[PDB]
Motif scaffolding. Structure first.
Motif, short mmCIF file in Angstrom:
data_model
loop_
_atom_site.label_atom_id
_atom_site.label_comp_id
_atom_site.label_asym_id
_atom_site.label_seq_id
_atom_site.Cartn_x
_atom_site.Cartn_y
_atom_site.Cartn_z
N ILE B 55 -41.30 -40.57 -13.23
CA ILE B 55 -41.92 -39.56 -12.37
C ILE B 55 -40.99 -39.24 -11.21
CG2 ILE B 55 -43.81 -39.19 -10.75
CD1 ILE B 55 -45.53 -40.94 -12.77
N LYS B 56 -40.36 -40.28 -10.64
CA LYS B 56 -39.46 -40.10 -9.51
C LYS B 56 -38.32 -39.15 -9.86
CE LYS B 56 -36.20 -40.48 -6.64
NZ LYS B 56 -34.73 -40.69 -6.46
N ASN B 57 -37.64 -39.41 -10.98
CA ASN B 57 -36.49 -38.59 -11.35
C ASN B 57 -36.92 -37.16 -11.65
OD1 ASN B 57 -34.69 -40.77 -11.12
ND2 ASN B 57 -35.13 -41.43 -13.22
N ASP B 58 -37.97 -37.00 -12.46
CA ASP B 58 -38.43 -35.66 -12.80
C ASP B 58 -38.76 -34.85 -11.55
OD1 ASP B 58 -38.07 -36.38 -15.41
OD2 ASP B 58 -40.20 -36.59 -15.88
N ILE B 59 -39.42 -35.47 -10.58
CA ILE B 59 -39.78 -34.76 -9.36
C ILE B 59 -38.54 -34.29 -8.62
CG2 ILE B 59 -40.97 -34.96 -7.14
CD1 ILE B 59 -43.10 -36.49 -8.32
N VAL B 60 -37.46 -35.08 -8.67
CA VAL B 60 -36.19 -34.63 -8.10
C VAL B 60 -35.76 -33.32 -8.75
CG1 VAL B 60 -33.75 -35.17 -7.81
CG2 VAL B 60 -35.48 -36.93 -7.37
N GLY B 61 -35.85 -33.24 -10.08
CA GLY B 61 -35.51 -31.99 -10.75
C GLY B 61 -36.45 -30.86 -10.39
N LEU B 62 -37.75 -31.16 -10.28
CA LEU B 62 -38.71 -30.14 -9.88
C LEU B 62 -38.39 -29.61 -8.48
CD1 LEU B 62 -42.11 -31.53 -11.22
CD2 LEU B 62 -40.56 -29.81 -12.22
N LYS B 63 -37.90 -30.49 -7.60
CA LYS B 63 -37.54 -30.07 -6.26
C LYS B 63 -36.38 -29.08 -6.29
CE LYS B 63 -38.54 -33.22 -2.89
NZ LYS B 63 -39.17 -33.08 -1.55
N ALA B 64 -35.32 -29.43 -7.03
CA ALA B 64 -34.16 -28.55 -7.11
C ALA B 64 -34.50 -27.26 -7.81
CB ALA B 64 -33.02 -29.27 -7.83
N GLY B 65 -35.17 -27.36 -8.96
CA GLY B 65 -35.58 -26.16 -9.67
C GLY B 65 -36.41 -25.22 -8.83
N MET B 66 -37.24 -25.76 -7.93
CA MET B 66 -38.09 -24.90 -7.12
C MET B 66 -37.30 -24.20 -6.03
SD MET B 66 -41.13 -25.43 -4.64
CE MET B 66 -42.14 -23.99 -4.51
N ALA B 67 -36.33 -24.91 -5.44
CA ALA B 67 -35.39 -24.26 -4.53
C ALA B 67 -34.73 -23.05 -5.20
CB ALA B 67 -34.35 -25.25 -4.03
N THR B 68 -34.39 -23.19 -6.48
CA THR B 68 -33.83 -22.07 -7.24
C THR B 68 -34.79 -20.89 -7.26
OG1 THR B 68 -32.48 -23.54 -8.62
CG2 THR B 68 -33.00 -21.34 -9.49
N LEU B 69 -36.05 -21.14 -7.62
CA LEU B 69 -37.03 -20.06 -7.70
C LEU B 69 -37.24 -19.41 -6.33
CD1 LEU B 69 -37.23 -20.91 -10.44
CD2 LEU B 69 -39.64 -21.53 -10.19
N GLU B 70 -37.26 -20.25 -5.29
CA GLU B 70 -37.44 -19.82 -3.88
C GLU B 70 -36.28 -18.90 -3.49
OE1 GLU B 70 -39.06 -21.84 0.22
OE2 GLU B 70 -37.76 -23.06 -1.06
N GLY B 71 -35.08 -19.17 -4.02
CA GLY B 71 -33.89 -18.35 -3.71
C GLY B 71 -34.08 -16.92 -4.17
N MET B 72 -34.68 -16.73 -5.35
CA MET B 72 -34.96 -15.38 -5.91
C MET B 72 -35.66 -14.53 -4.84
SD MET B 72 -37.89 -14.41 -8.68
CE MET B 72 -38.48 -12.73 -8.85
#
Lengths: 74, 72, 39, 72
Positions: B55-72
């Motif tokens: 869960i810890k690692n996946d959430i790290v990816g969710l954090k980065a991926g969401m920054a990507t979406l936020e950039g749009m």
């Protein structure tokens, strides 16, 4: 009936027989002492991770605020 | 001259000690069995701690991926 | 020295004193049994 | 006539029983103290189980909110 050496000897064997039960108790409580020590170490490991949960709780709260931001931006 | 009956109090005291020691034995054998159960269940809990860091690692990816979406 | 009643009585009191230690052990292991069940 | 020395084996056997019972007592007092520690730490673990269901509820919202974004 006069008291005889055999009467005293009977009590000696009774006490020595009781001593074998005492010996099993002592062996078992020492084993329990070692095992409770090991159990506590494992409980310690569980406790250390339980607050990794608190960080997870925070990250998820951050993800929620973000997701609302995405929806707010439309 | 001492008589057999002069030993009665000692015989009874040892009988009572033996009865109480036997009840300790019964109880500590039960503690041993209970400890087996506790150890097995704590080992089970400890094993699931692998999910937490996954869960810890996946959430790290969710954090980065969401920054990507936020950039749009 | 001839064995006397007082010699037997000394062992009785020794055993009864030991019995108090046995009683503490028994009380404590029963308490541990209840507490391990709750745990 | 029985002599004082005729009781020696019984005296020694009771002395040895008492020494071993004393070591049981020392050990069970330690088990009592250890159990205090285990109980406190398990209660701590049990309390953090509140975070798990909070995570549970929030994730439900994240699921619905994400369905919204996917439609958009």
């Amino acid at each position: 009936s006069p008291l005889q050496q055999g009467d005293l000897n009977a009590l000696v064997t009774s006490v020595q027989s009781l001593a074998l039960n005492v010996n099993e108790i002592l062996n078992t409580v020492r084993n329990l002492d070692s095992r409770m020590n090991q159990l506590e170490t494992k409980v310690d490991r569980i406790l250390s991770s339980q607050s990794l949960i608190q960080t997870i709780k925070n990250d998820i709260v951050g993800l929620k605020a973000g997701m609302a931001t995405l929806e707010g931006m439309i």
